[PDB]
């Protein structure tokens, strides 16, 4: 396992180099949009982000050390959390707004979306309030990938797999601490910020579950276009 052998700095470098790009939406200010067509812009964008996410996951240390069945499971459980934290990260420098894309920056003003919209804004405010660093962000994102589905996986052999994930998770924790120490934080401050960062994941999991329900409702209404990949990721959550 090349993952467990990495140093903290090597871990951060690998995660930074693996970052997916920021994609554009098909938004057009000269074109009128309904609530459904606006939502169509987002589902289209999310679908495209997913393709990049899947290949990003391959570059997260330890992920490919897992069986294909386990990788599938982890991505199926964490995909929406990862899309969301990515969205919040983009919006950090834009108080009151969500940067779905460089050409699509919305405030809460512009259909049952407001509730989740507000939660995302609150998280963005939180990141800004904490002065969340890019190095910390990539750590958080990889933690979600490995953590969200680890307790919903048979044999003692299947138990060995989960053990590997825990060791990688511990390694990322070490990296987070390393980053904070370098930042000049006292030991007490390092432990506090670590807690603050990880508590974020609870709220992100919450937004993901609320979003999954909104997504299921969208499917049933059959008015907003949903990609096949998206429909399969949705079905994986058996709502």
């Amino acid at each position: 396992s090349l993952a467990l052998s990495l140093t903290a700095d090597q871990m951060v470098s690998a995660l930074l180099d693996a970052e997916p790009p920021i994609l554009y939406s098909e938004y057009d200010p000269t074109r009128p949009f309904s609530e459904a067509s606006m939502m169509g812009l987002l589902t289209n964008l999310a679908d495209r982000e997913l393709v990049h996410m899947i290949n990003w996951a391959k570059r997260v240390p330890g992920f490919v050390d897992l069986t294909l069945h386990d990788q599938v499971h982890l991505l199926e459980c964490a995909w929406l959390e990862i899309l969301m934290i990515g969205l919040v990260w983009r919006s950090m420098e834009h108080p009151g707004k969500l940067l779905f894309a460089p050409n699509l920056l919305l405030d809460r003003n512009q259909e049952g979306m407001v509730e989740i919209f507000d939660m995302l804004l609150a998280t963005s405010s939180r990141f800004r309030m904490m002065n969340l660093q890019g190095e910390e962000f990539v750590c958080l994102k990889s933690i979600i990938l490995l953590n969200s589905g680890v307790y919903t996986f048979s044999t003692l052999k299947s138990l060995e797999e989960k053990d590997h994930i825990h060791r990688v998770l511990d390694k990322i924790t070490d990296t987070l601490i390393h980053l904070m120490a370098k930042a000049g934080l006292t030991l007490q401050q390092q432990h506090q910020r670590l807690a603050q960062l990880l508590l974020i994941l609870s709220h992100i999991r919450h937004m993901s579950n609320k979003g999954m329900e909104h997504l299921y409702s969208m499917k049933c209404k059959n008015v907003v276009p949903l990609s096949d990949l998206l429909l399969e990721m949705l079905d994986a959550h058996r709502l």
């Binding site: 899947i54 996951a57 294909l68 599938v72 991505l75 096949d228 990949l229």
Partner: peptide
């Protein structure tokens, strides 16, 4: 699954 195939490359 699609996710399954994409992971396989």
């Amino acid at each position: 699954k699609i996710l399954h195939r994409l992971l396989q490359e």
